[PDB]
Amino acid sequence: TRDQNGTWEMESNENFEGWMKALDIDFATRKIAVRLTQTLVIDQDGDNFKTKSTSTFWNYDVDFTVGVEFDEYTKSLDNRHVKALVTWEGDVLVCVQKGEKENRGWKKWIEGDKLYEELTCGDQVCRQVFKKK
Ligand SMILES: *C/C=C(\C)c1ccc(-c2ccc(OC)cc2)s1
Structure with missing residues (x-):
């Protein structure tokens, strides 16, 4: 299924700090942020x-249309400019953020009843699992 609508509550987080460090996020922000449970809210209609x-430490929103490149400022995460593109590979939603960092973006997929995601930057992969509230 490609339908990723829902309020998704984190069950598992792995290597979130490695991803943040590859983005050069500073020590103090990383030390607090690595402790935290996350939520992901997705509102999906067509593309x-x-x-x-x-x-508790951030609230970041992004809107996009599948298949439409968008120039993006990454805002409080790392204050960088990227060219972002979100597409489907099968039932995997794949985002590539082209810019200074290599291998930067994320992937989301439904597996069973849960939402799985990867957060990537450089040689780092953060893996997360969420349950649908
Ligand atoms: C589809 C998944 C997205 C858009 C994100 C996963 C983690 C995100 C994030 C954004 C910003 C901060 O710090 C401000 C932390 C995590 S976004």
């Missing part, structure tokens, strides 16, 4: 997505 990632 049109609204995605929110939140914890």
Whole structure:
């Protein structure tokens, strides 16, 4: 299934700090952020997505249309400019953010009843699992 709508509550997080470090996020922010449970809210209608990632320490939203490149400022995460593109590979939603960092982006897929995601930057992969609230 390609339908990723829902309020997704984190069950598992792995190597979130490695991903943040590859983005050069500073020590103090990483030390706090690595402790935190996350939520991911996805509003999906056709190609049109609204995605929110939140914890007690951040609340980041991004809107996009599958298949349409968008020039993006990454805002409070790392204040960088990238050319972002989200597409489907089978039932995997793949985002590539072209810019200074290599291998940068994320992937999301439904597996069983859960939402799995990968967060990538450089040689680092963060793996996460969420349950649908
Ligand atoms: C589809 C998944 C997305 C858009 C994200 C997963 C983690 C995100 C994130 C954004 C910003 C911060 O710090 C401000 C932390 C995590 S976004």
